[PDB]
Amino acid sequence: QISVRGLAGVENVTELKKNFNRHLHFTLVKDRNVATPRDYYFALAHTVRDHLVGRWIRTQQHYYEKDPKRIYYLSLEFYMGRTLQNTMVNLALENACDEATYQLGLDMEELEEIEEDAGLGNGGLGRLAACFLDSMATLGLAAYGYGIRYEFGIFNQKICGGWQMEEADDWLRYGNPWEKARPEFTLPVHFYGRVEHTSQGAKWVDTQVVLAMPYDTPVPGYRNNVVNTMRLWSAKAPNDGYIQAVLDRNLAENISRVLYPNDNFFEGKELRLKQEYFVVAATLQDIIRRFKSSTNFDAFPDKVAIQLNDTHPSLAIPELMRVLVDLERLDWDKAWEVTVKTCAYTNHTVIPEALERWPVHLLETLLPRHLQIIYEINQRFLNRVAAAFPGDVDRLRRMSLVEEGAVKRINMAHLCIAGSHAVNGVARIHSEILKKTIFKDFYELEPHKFQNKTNGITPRRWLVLCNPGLAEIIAERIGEEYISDLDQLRKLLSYVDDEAFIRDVAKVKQENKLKFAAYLEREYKVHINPNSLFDVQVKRIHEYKRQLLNCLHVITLYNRIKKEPNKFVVPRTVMIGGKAAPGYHMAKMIIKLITAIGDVVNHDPVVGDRLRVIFLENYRVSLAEKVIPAADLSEQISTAGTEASGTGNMKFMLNGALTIGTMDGANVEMAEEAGEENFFIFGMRVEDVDRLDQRGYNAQEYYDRIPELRQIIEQLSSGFFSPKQPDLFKDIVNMLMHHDRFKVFADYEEYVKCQERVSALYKNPREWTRMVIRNIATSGKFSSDRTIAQYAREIWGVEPSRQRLPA
Amino acid sequence: QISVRGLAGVENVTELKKNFNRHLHFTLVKDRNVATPRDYYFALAHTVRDHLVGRWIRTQQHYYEKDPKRIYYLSLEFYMGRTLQNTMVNLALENACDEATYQLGLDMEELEEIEEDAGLGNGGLGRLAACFLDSMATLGLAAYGYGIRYEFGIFNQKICGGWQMEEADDWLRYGNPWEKARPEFTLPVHFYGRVEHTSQGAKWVDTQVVLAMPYDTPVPGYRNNVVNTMRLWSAKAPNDGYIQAVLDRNLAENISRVLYPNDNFFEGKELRLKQEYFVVAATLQDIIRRFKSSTNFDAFPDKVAIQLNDTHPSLAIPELMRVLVDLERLDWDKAWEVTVKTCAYTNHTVIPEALERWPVHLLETLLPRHLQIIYEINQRFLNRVAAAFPGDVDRLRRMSLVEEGAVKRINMAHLCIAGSHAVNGVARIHSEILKKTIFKDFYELEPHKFQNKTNGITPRRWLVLCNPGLAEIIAERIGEEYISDLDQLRKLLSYVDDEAFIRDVAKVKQENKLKFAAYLEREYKVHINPNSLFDVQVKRIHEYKRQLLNCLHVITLYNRIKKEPNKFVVPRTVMIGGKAAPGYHMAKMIIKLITAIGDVVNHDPVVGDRLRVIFLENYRVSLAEKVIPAADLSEQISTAGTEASGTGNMKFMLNGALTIGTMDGANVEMAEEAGEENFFIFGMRVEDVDRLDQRGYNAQEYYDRIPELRQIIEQLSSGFFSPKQPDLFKDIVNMLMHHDRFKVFADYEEYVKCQERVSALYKNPREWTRMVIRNIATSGKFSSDRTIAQYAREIWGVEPSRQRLPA
Numbered sequence A, B: 001q002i003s004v005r006g007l008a009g010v011e012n013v014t015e016l017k018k019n020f021n022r023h024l025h026f027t028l029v030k031d032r033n034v035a036t037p038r039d040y041y042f043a044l045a046h047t048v049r050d051h052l053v054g055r056w057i058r059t060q061q062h063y064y065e066k067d068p069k070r071i072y073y074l075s076l077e078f079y080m081g082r083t084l085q086n087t088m089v090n091l092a093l094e095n096a097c098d099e100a101t102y103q104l105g106l107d108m109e110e111l112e113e114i115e116e117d118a119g120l121g122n123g124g125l126g127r128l129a130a131c132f133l134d135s136m137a138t139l140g141l142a143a144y145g146y147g148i149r150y151e152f153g154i155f156n157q158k159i160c161g162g163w164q165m166e167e168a169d170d171w172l173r174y175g176n177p178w179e180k181a182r183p184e185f186t187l188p189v190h191f192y193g194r195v196e197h198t199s200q201g202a203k204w205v206d207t208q209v210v211l212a213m214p215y216d217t218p219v220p221g222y223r224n225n226v227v228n229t230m231r232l233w234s235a236k237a238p239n240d241g242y243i244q245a246v247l248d249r250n251l252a253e254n255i256s257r258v259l260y261p262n263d264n265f266f267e268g269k270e271l272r273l274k275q276e277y278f279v280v281a282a283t284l285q286d287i288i289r290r291f292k293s294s295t296n297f298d299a300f301p302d303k304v305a306i307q308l309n310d311t312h313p314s315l316a317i318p319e320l321m322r323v324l325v326d327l328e329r330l331d332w333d334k335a336w337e338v339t340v341k342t343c344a345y346t347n348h349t350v351i352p353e354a355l356e357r358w359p360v361h362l363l364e365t366l367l368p369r370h371l372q373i374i375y376e377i378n379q380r381f382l383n384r385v386a387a388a389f390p391g392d393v394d395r396l397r398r399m400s401l402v403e404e405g406a407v408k409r410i411n412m413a414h415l416c417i418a419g420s421h422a423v424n425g426v427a428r429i430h431s432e433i434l435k436k437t438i439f440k441d442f443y444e445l446e447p448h449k450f451q452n453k454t455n456g457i458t459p460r461r462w463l464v465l466c467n468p469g470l471a472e473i474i475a476e477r478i479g480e481e482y483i484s485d486l487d488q489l490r491k492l493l494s495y496v497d498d499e500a501f502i503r504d505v506a507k508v509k510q511e512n513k514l515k516f517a518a519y520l521e522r523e524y525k526v527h528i529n530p531n532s533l534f535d536v537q538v539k540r541i542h543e544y545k546r547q548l549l550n551c552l553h554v555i556t557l558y559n560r561i562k563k564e565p566n567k568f569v570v571p572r573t574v575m576i577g578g579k580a581a582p583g584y585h586m587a588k589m590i591i592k593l594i595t596a597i598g599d600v601v602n603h604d605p606v607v608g609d610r611l612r613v614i615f616l617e618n619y620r621v622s623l624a625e626k627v628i629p630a631a632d633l634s635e636q637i638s639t640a641g642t643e644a645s646g647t648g649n650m651k652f653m654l655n656g657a658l659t660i661g662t663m664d665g666a667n668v669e670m671a672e673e674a675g676e677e678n679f680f681i682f683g684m685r686v687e688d689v690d691r692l693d694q695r696g697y698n699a700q701e702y703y704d705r706i707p708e709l710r711q712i713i714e715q716l717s718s719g720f721f722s723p724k725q726p727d728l729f730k731d732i733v734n735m736l737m738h739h740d741r742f743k744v745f746a747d748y749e750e751y752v753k754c755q756e757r758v759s760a761l762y763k764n765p766r767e768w769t770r771m772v773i774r775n776i777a778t779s780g781k782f783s784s785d786r787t788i789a790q791y792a793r794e795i796w797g798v799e800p801s802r803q804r805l806p807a
């Protein structure tokens, strides 16, 4: 049906049909008489998987032969989503499989919905790693993703009486056809023990052993026949009352059991530290083995790059030192040179409570050799600081890897800067803030280390896969080459005055909204007006992301309607979705508020279908692929200086939504690319937030001066949105009035006024769509292909290539 | 090469080769350049598995269509061993796969050794279930094996300094190609809670739910295209700090973690009770579902038979009652009629410490509704006893299901007799003892219930598979039909004076001994003389099995050699192997003694290669398949009245070894079949043991009267076999002298004299082999095909059939 979905050749369709029937019979052991939709999904998945295998084997064989520099991307999170459609897209199999399944009397779309998300991440950081894997494969890099195979990913979110409930994400229950267990490549990982000093160096002895078993998942590039590997480690007990000893094996295997869902506050939990070391120790053994098959470690940095996604895998730095010094017998200075040239570190937030600061007593017990190595790193680093800034004693305490106090801690961010040749932020404004504030001292010592790499998203998943209608109307005009060269979307500016294209763009959006409106009716008991403005804020629930500011506007619109019922207002469907960390009380209260607002607003007869507030349950990659194509307005309203980049913002821009946002993270670069006139910018800049911090933020001032704001707070306090429990939202009110770190009130007025300008433009469909075209056309910078090309050239020292392997 | 191994057709060989290469590439994701022997094993296993699938689907479809009476064999143990060779044998694929692999440059024998045993049983009871599955499939019965998929089977046994060490049997590490997970058929199982009495009957509420996930394994019949199912349940937690709750899922999943290895003493452990109910509750839901697809429960016993392997699944009786009464709303009397007609119970030991007697307080907490049902069963049963034997108050307390005392217990054996239409022992002498002693009262009340079903072994695994050389020389003379009709071996009596056959029989044995002698050298550091008499006792270590009596003879032979070094004695290799239950101190001491004897005997220069004592490490099904074909003498020396049947005894008889044994278990019937002159019978009969118990067993008497016995005990006491720890064996000596339940000394003299007659005959190779032929020729009764045919006709009410399905 759709040209970008590839050719449906008669031989290809015939072959897929027979291999589908083969797997149903031999692989699933099912007859057609009792087969269910799930069985049919698995037969299709196995059929598509077969097409990956030949390419996977020859790609990996090709790397062994040519011995290029290898890129190791270390992350505790890979937020992969579903794999079936992505695989079909990247192999040019989508139309063929669609035909083959139709001929067997099946709907492929229905089968696609059966696949569980691989939800092995929390949000943006996890999803960035996933987009990065796709781009590295598309750009022909010899890249490996390394992480943990969590048995349970991010929890499934149920909403019960307006409250978030958490449910185990048993994503492996029915099996994972995409992975291949490699028990033959199991490696030992050591914990605890003690350090022994011999005449012939230090020795780590009396350790407990946990085994790391790898599972490999293929990562196909876009139509280039490159298939890279994501290797995820699973924890296993070694084989050596009897019953109790066997049952206690669970203690070791708990390491890979569950993804930590806390994305707001650093908790120094021992199990988390074990997870971090587990991935690091197993991965580094693999890296070294693969390098030794190419032993002089001078060439190590020429053959290996290690990228640390946040400080989570920071133990890579002292682990590499441990192996080089203790096991390979290299002298300290040489090992350090190798380590620094090999490692690079990416930061994802300036928020202080997010920094990993591990208690010394924990490292002492768990990793005694690593603590000794960290101390030595610190001493040598501080000697260099002292020589560069003589007599500056305050600098020495500020830059130390060891933090003093009631409990001594290791600052893992400081460790990462010292042990890496490159440190990057994830958007221009973020990287600047790093140099000006949190890492200022480090920048003054080693300016050359600090870089920017503005984030991106893969246009395969985030356009072609989730929005085929838009991909097609674009391809009709400019061809298919933009899919792997997103800059070509600029050519669409020549169609901004084209009446046919304007109509098509608006048509694709309407079709997307109808489809999502129906989806909401089918799987939930909610009806929405598809003619209304789809106002969408989807992301993890955090105070800094200011879902609360959105909530205030919603109540403002409601109150205005109650004030002047017979006045025309642009109809809106306000959709807010996202998970809250299980221990984050305030975020759980915000979810409750959103549903409570909905309960009042959605049932007021005076409102009608002019305003609807829906909380989107269980927001995850697969839901993002559904809602983002349907959005008219993208809410990106974090307090200036708090959202390092954002990536959701980029997804909306590529999919035909306009953006209301602060000048924060990548929003700044987005507005720069599209033009400020084509963006709905509001609120304080970073500098304005700084000035307000100087004199001190007083929320009472805004409450006193803005009558519409006052009414809302009084409504919250009196129990208007909670009649049975009048004081339910007292915590929220208290926070807003007395200790709001994120200055919700300070941006309220400008936010509301900006929202009026949005409504004004939506009344003129032609001008809305023309602005939309201007956004889509300039979204090319935000391809992760661009991002990865910059990492490759400026950090890893490798050249990307669009050249196809023979298959 | 071998005719019984089937045809190697050119098309079949070509097809197997290409499917082997297909699986290596697509299934294992390996190139030939890095493939290991293990990879090659898996590719072969998947290729052979494909040939099962079509037959498996159509067999199960055939049962759905024809709706025959279904046989459900419930066991907590299925001691399956390896599956690859058995599958090839039963599908007539062995020669074809041998050719196909040879042409690819591989040795199939080497690949076969890579497969892990499925060691989901302890010994005889577990192995009986496995032989029974094979025979039921071969006889065309609609039979299902139901059990638990233990993550860890029977422990691997390491011998360290002469002591047994236990190691986890991680048999699933590399995956199990034979099983198919069926997560779609997961069923709930309830624990704890309380009983609520409503107007509309009893209700079991507030329970904890554990999920039962089935895994199906195919069971191929011998060349009849029948493939039955073994369904094994795996425990899973339902999906509903956050981290802790996820980690605590292990508590539920512990139910299927490990096989209980205690085969000597009943321990009322809660986890064991949970295992027993788990298998029962999940299985019964399956049985009922399948029956409802054929709701009047009058026909239930006409469509369902449930066989209880020991009392381990005895909870089937009150569970069936629970479902019929509480859920289906049948009146008590009707439900009871159905239950009794459906269930049958097999007993495996008369030893009192083996009886399952569950504390009432445990059942009260865990299964409160079942305890109520058990009480009601007991009351109604005791009312019947009272009516049949009025005024016999002693009978009432003896027959009660409830046992009185400091702690109240439920006798599960009494429950099984009350709730079953048939109760059987496993050999004629055993079944008689049941009627005369332990179940006398029950036999007087319901004589019709009590039956004998003499055990058997499958001649597929225990002749064709493990001893192809013997299978071939037999087939040359009488054809191939004996393999599924073992009675035909009687035709071999006409060859007892045939010089060619005598030579062939002796040749096959010599070749088997050379092969096993080499195996011992290759995988261990032990050399043996292949010309010596191979004297073998392999079985679990128990006091009743009297490995200690064997030990006394070995020391006797050693002492005689030291006394008269220059006198000729028939050279012997004495092999003893078997695992001891981890908590069984005495059995662990016996293993230590055996190795300690070896340390002295094997290193005495005066002895030479005339006597060797070897402990066979890690005895298990795969090792049994190697050692049994190599044996000359089979030691079956339990105290008369203690070994219910034995099955190892039958394996040796079929494989060309002569038997030294007591008149115990199936030994009696074996000697009856072969002729007493062709058996080495010694020792007390049951009646003699009884008489000795009357006057009281005094071991001191034998010590005083037998100088050779006295010398041995003094050697043990003084530290002759343990110079560093002189008192190491004081526990053994103390037991032998003062509290030996099994009367080791009483049989010593007759045992030693009998062993001299064995040595005498071995000096005459021609007459040895003629006696061997007389044994093999009369071993037909001991086929499990015969056993299963008797169960089918006399208990289950179904007719067996050798008729082949179309494939």
Ligand SMILES: O=C(NC(=O)c1cccc2ccccc12)N[C@@H]1O[C@H](CO)[C@@H](O)[C@H](O)[C@H]1O
Binding pocket: A122, A123, A124, A125, A126, A128, A262, A263, A264, A265, A266, A348, A349, A353, A354, A426, A455, A643, A644, A645, A646, A647, A665
């Ligand atoms: O998702 C992020 N962090 C986590 O999920 C996270 C994961 C684990 C622990 C955390 C502790 C504190 C704060 C966050 C986490 N960070 C996001 O990274 C994206 C990719 O660079 C950025 O676009 C986004 O601004 C940032 O918040």
Ligand SMILES: O=C(NC(=O)c1cccc2ccccc12)N[C@@H]1O[C@H](CO)[C@@H](O)[C@H](O)[C@H]1O
Binding pocket: B122, B123, B124, B125, B126, B128, B262, B263, B264, B265, B266, B348, B349, B353, B354, B426, B455, B643, B644, B645, B646, B647, B665
């Ligand atoms: O193996 C047996 N029992 C167990 O493994 C066993 C399994 C579990 C618990 C036990 C408790 C006490 C005694 C034995 C067990 N019994 C054997 O059953 C065979 C098959 O009928 C007989 O040939 C043999 O005589 C009997 O000992």
Ligand SMILES: O=c1[nH]cnc2c1ncn2[C@@H]1O[C@H](COP(=O)(O)O)[C@@H](O)[C@H]1O
Binding pocket: A057, A060, A061, A064, A290, B031, B033, B034
């Ligand atoms: O020793 C070797 N000889 C030939 N090829 C090898 C060897 N080692 C690795 N390879 C190839 O490199 C691929 C990936 O190796 P890995 O990166 O070490 O897992 C393998 O699948 C082989 O195709």
Ligand SMILES: O=c1[nH]cnc2c1ncn2[C@@H]1O[C@H](COP(=O)(O)O)[C@@H](O)[C@H]1O
Binding pocket: A031, A033, A034, B057, B060, B061, B064, B290
């Ligand atoms: O509802 C049905 N319609 C047609 N065949 C069925 C149906 N239910 C079961 N079967 C057949 O019976 C086989 C085994 O069913 P089970 O014994 O219930 O697992 C299935 O594989 C099918 O071939």
Ligand SMILES: *Cc1c(COP(=O)(O)O)cnc(C)c1O
Binding pocket: A122, A123, A124, A127, A538, A539, A540, A619, A620, A621, A624, A645, A646, A647, A648, A649, A651
């Ligand atoms: C893109 C994405 C995110 C990141 O969104 P931000 O608005 O940048 O925080 C979080 N979760 C999912 C499922 C995503 O796809």
Ligand SMILES: *Cc1c(COP(=O)(O)O)cnc(C)c1O
Binding pocket: B122, B123, B124, B127, B538, B539, B540, B619, B620, B621, B624, B645, B646, B647, B648, B649, B651
């Ligand atoms: C046959 C068998 C047994 C039973 O042997 P008995 O001598 O009858 O106790 C025990 N273990 C294995 C592995 C067997 O094959």
